[PDB]
């Protein structure tokens, strides 16, 4: 079975819906992308898995191979994108468009096209001919949970030399990122009337109580760790919600915050949870059973690619291009935890979950090359 | 699209392309070279066919892709050796497997080493390639070696390094001596054996020539030495002499047929020297009479140095060591270009003889060998 031409296949892609939400009725199955993957790797001549990815709504990981023995690349990326508001789209997200140098479409840019350049590149490539193993891995959940990764990583055998994550980066290399931690931290007050307000407990008090805690550790994260390559250079922490209470004149009987934290790599999520409980400690301590901190997505360390590897050496010379590093969280620190990685792909992160998404056709040729130039170094010598 | 492996190599086989000093056996190789340069073309190669001077209507075949410094050469020769009929038990022309081996004419030497070239290529993007390769077909090897000879003194090309595919069971080979076979001729002058003195008597000149000439052979095995070949000196060699009518005539001609190997690092104008040197009291006391004819090309020793980096891929490669021979072929000629080995599949022991087959079990290495030779010096 002959592989269709790049832009049927980038058509295929953007034409089978993949959105992963929280919310089950906007939550996609990625079995239908997965399965279209799957056979074209299958078709190309590989060896394909596709496992049920446990704990999920009937997603599915799918691991494409070509040979055996040790090393060899690993390209990956994630199958689900993220939803649509079909208020702001002036177009069939579902179907790709190109207009002006650009092609539209949901997950384009995050991150569709690069399985599409992905399968191009290899058309004619003879996978008996390789000496070292190629491996592709195609990921579930990664807008929501990470699920897909994490499990594969939690699980996988292999150890491959290096991998490359093609998220949209304007196909700059980048090295490291920051970690991101989600967090409800919920407070149980009691009711009564505003008459008489030392007769319940307040939650906004005891929430103010939990948030001076909170400043504290945001102050002390951004006194104590520093990184200047980061545009951001401390690890950062946010206020993005807060809800409570019925009326002016009952007492508060309940409160929740919701907050984020942004590490920088090297810090454990053991570390940073210990922080935030001790932060914590002396509200749970005075009212206990009362304060509860709840995930509102599992969380994600920092990660960053060591040096003198030669992934770097090869694609910075392939780009004339140095590493960069973003603030931003992707699969990487678990994909990191078999092997050196780098996030490298087309498109950019400005046109990332946006109202009509596109790709830049310019993009094309040069992801091309820098595809069947990382498959030649790494697979073929 | 090329035909299949072995499509090419039948066809080629089944092109006549012997070479023969006898015009009546001789055939013209043009049809071999027109199957190559169509089939190099096929592959977007820019290929030159150029009449080689001299010869019987022979051709060779430069096929070139890429442009400026370097490279790899890639070089064989299109003619085979005759065939004795009564000795071959299948058709010379038609490519047959048997157990393993596949029989014909020139399958080990040396027609084999193009197909497997073409093969090597077939899905190879010459487009991509960041430094020239180059495809060299002579004509006349088995003879005069005279494509060879035309080509080393015309091309201005200089490749990095260059490998000519004859059969050497894929196992490396960096040196050989050389070859050089003269007739000494002495004109006498007759006269009847009861009056010496009115005469000149060849066999007695030849007499003093070869006193001369076994000094000079006892010089050459004493003075020079290469510890890999078997006979570690170069050797010369008496093999023929004819003079004179009869016991009761003075002897009015002598001539004597010999040969000298050199060792590689000699070149042909020091041995000439040495002989003409070792020659020189008989010359200088009879003027005009002592000529010195050569009864084929002669052929300089080769060596390429140990240590090349081309040495270095293919023992890698090959996990075979290199070795000498003592046999010659036209790497002297192409090592004035660039650093040279002989190597490719077949053996020698099936070379020149009936029956004559290259076993398949060659095919795999031989093309992984070309490919990574072509990657190693051609593609980055
Ligand atoms: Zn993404
Ligand atoms: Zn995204
Ligand atoms: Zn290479
Ligand atoms: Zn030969
Ligand atoms: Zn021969």
């Given at each position: 079975?002959?592989?269709p031409?790049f832009?049927?296949?980038?058509?295929?892609?953007?034409?089978?819906?993949?959105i992963s939400?929280?919310?089950e009725?906007?939550?996609q199955?990625?079995?239908?992308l997965?399965?279209?993957?799957?056979?074209?790797?299958?078709?190309?001549?590989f060896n394909v898995?596709?496992?049920?990815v446990?704990?999920?709504?009937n997603?599915?990981?799918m691991?494409?191979?070509?040979?055996?023995?040790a090393?060899?690349?690993?390209?990956?990326?994630?199958?689900?994108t993220?939803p649509?508001?079909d208020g702001?789209?002036?177009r069939d997200?579902?179907?790709?468009?190109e207009?002006?140098?650009?092609?539209?479409?949901?997950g384009?840019?995050?991150?569709?096209?690069?399985?599409?350049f992905?399968?191009?590149?290899?058309?004619?490539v003879?996978?008996?001919?390789?000496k070292?193993?190629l491996?592709?891995?195609?990921?579930?959940?990664?807008?929501?949970?990470?699920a897909?990764?994490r499990?594969?990583?939690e699980?996988?055998?292999?150890?491959p030399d290096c991998?490359?994550?093609?998220?949209?980066?304007?196909?700059?290399?980048?090295?490291?990122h920051?970690?991101?931690?989600?967090?409800?931290?919920?407070?149980q007050?009691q009711?009564?009337?505003?008459?008489?307000?030392?007769?319940?407990?307040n939650?906004?008090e005891?929430?103010?109580?939990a948030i001076?805690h909170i400043?504290?550790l945001?102050?002390?994260?951004?006194?104590?760790?520093?990184?200047?390559?980061?545009?951001?250079?401390?690890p950062?922490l946010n206020?993005?919600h807060?809800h409570?209470?019925?009326?002016?004149?009952?007492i508060?009987?309940?409160?929740?915050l919701?907050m984020?934290?942004?590490?920088?790599?090297?810090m454990t999520?053991?570390?940073?949870?210990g922080?935030?409980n001790?932060?914590?400690?002396?509200?749970s301590?005075?009212?206990?059973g009362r304060?509860?901190?709840?995930?509102?997505?599992?969380?994600?360390?920092?990660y960053?690619?060591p040096?003198n590897?030669?992934?770097?050496?090869?694609?910075?010379?392939?780009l004339?291009?140095?590493?960069?590093?973003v603030?931003y969280?992707?699969?990487?620190?678990?994909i990191?935890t078999?092997?050196p990685?780098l996030?490298?792909?087309?498109?950019?992160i400005?046109?990332?979950?946006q109202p009509?998404?596109?790709?830049?056709?310019?993009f094309?040729?040069?992801?091309?090359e820098?595809?069947t130039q990382?498959?030649?170094?790494?697979?073929?010598?």
């Amino acid at each position: 079975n002959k592989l269709p031409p790049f832009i049927e296949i980038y058509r295929a892609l953007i034409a089978t819906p993949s959105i992963s939400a929280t919310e089950e009725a906007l939550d996609q199955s990625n079995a239908d992308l997965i399965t279209l993957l799957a056979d074209w790797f299958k078709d190309l001549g590989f060896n394909v898995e596709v496992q049920p990815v446990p704990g999920t709504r009937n997603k599915f990981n799918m691991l494409a191979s070509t040979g055996q023995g040790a090393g060899g690349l690993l390209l990956a990326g994630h199958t689900d994108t993220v939803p649509f508001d079909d208020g702001r789209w002036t177009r069939d997200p579902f179907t790709l468009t190109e207009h002006d140098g650009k092609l539209y479409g949901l997950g384009t840019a995050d991150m569709k096209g690069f399985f599409a350049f992905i399968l191009d590149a290899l058309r004619d490539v003879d996978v008996t001919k390789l000496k070292k193993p190629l491996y592709i891995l195609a990921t579930a959940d990664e807008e929501t949970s990470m699920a897909g990764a994490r499990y594969f990583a939690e699980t996988t055998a292999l150890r491959p030399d290096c991998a490359i994550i093609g998220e949209p980066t304007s196909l700059q290399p980048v090295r490291a990122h920051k970690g991101h931690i989600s967090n409800a931290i919920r407070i149980q007050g009691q009711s009564g009337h505003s008459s008489d307000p030392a007769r319940g407990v307040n939650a906004i008090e005891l929430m103010h109580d939990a948030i001076g805690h909170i400043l504290q550790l945001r102050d002390n994260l951004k006194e104590r760790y520093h990184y200047e390559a980061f545009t951001v250079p401390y690890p950062t922490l946010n206020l993005g919600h807060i809800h409570g209470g019925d009326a002016s004149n009952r007492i508060c009987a309940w409160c929740e915050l919701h907050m984020d934290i942004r590490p920088l790599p090297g810090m454990t999520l053991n570390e940073l949870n210990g922080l935030l409980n001790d932060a914590l400690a002396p509200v749970s301590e005075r009212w206990p059973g009362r304060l509860t901190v709840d995930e509102l997505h599992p969380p994600i360390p920092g990660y960053e690619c060591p040096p003198n590897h030669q992934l770097v050496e090869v694609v910075e010379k392939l780009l004339g291009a140095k590493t960069e590093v973003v603030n931003y969280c992707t699969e990487a620190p678990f994909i990191q935890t078999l092997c050196p990685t780098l996030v490298l792909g087309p498109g950019s992160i400005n046109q990332a979950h946006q109202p009509d998404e596109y790709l830049e056709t310019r993009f094309i040729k040069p992801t091309r090359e820098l595809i069947t130039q990382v498959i030649h170094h790494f697979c073929w010598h």
